[PDB]
Design a protein around this ligand. Structure first.
Ligand code: ADN
Ligand code: CL
Ligand code: NA
Lengths: 215, 6
């Protein structure tokens, strides 16, 4: 464990050195919730490596740099109402909760992963995270609107339900592209008259599967 | 390398 954490601190230092982690909030979250806490034992020895790792049901937990990039873009503030689409391991949701300091909602379509995430969260002592079973491409009406919606799987287009569930001034961070595994990281800000889209560049994510994702 | 990365 001490070994795993020391390797993790090196990872964090690297991200700060590369200018990936640039804010105090994100550094604090990363140091509080290392990725090894969210992966199966057989993968904990690779948790510090800056690339994605496998998780049950054929999915993956994103690479540290990607999670950092997306969190920095989110510019999370205490009290914000956040929705994550694609819970996976529960790692990103834990990081989010550490920054917003309130209830966090995250949705996952695979039952096995919903339980996987809940277990990781409980074991790590996270309390404010609610893991939901469902199709996140439809968002999560019960707690909308949101300050930020972070999608961790790639879509063929921007899901309309996600734009509708954003507070005016809120933002949707999502990988969108014409390929199942190759997308453009888009930051969509909701305005009083429509939206503003900022393209952050190429990324590679597992496909978002659902009504407003890949079918 | 598995898919999420940049
Ligand atoms: N429509 C969806 N709703 C919720 N989670 C999803 C959806 N499509 C893909 N995922 C999940 O995204 C997670 C990203 O790590 C995976 O665990 C994957 O199952
Ligand atoms: Cl549920
Ligand atoms: Na993933």
């Amino acid at each position: 464990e001490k070994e795993l954490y020391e390797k993790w601190m090196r990872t964090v230092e690297m991200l700060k050195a590369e200018g990936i982690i640039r804010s105090k909030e994100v550094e604090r979250a990363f140091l509080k919730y290392p990725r090894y806490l969210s992966v199966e034992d057989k993968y904990k020895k690779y948790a510090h490596i800056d690339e994605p790792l496998p998780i049950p049901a054929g999915q993956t937990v994103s690479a540290p740099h990607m999670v950092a990039i997306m969190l920095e873009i989110a510019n999370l503030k205490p009290g914000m109402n956040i929705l994550e689409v694609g819970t996976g391991s529960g790692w990103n949701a834990a990081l989010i909760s550490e920054i917003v300091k309130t209830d966090v909602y995250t949705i996952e379509r695979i039952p096995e992963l919903v339980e996987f995430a809940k277990r990781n969260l409980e074991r790590a002592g996270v309390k404010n995270v609610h893991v939901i079973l469902g199709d996140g491409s439809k968002g999560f009406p019960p707690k909308a609107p949101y300050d930020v919606i972070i999608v961790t799987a790639g879509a063929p287009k921007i899901p309309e339900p996600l734009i509708e569930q954003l507070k005016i001034g809120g933002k949707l961070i999502i990988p969108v592209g014409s390929y199942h595994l190759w997308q453009e990281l888009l930051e969509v800000r909701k305005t009083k008259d429509g939206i503003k889209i900022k393209n952050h560049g190429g990324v590679a994510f597992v496909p978002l599967i659902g009504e407003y994702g890949w079918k | 390398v598995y898919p999420x990365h940049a």
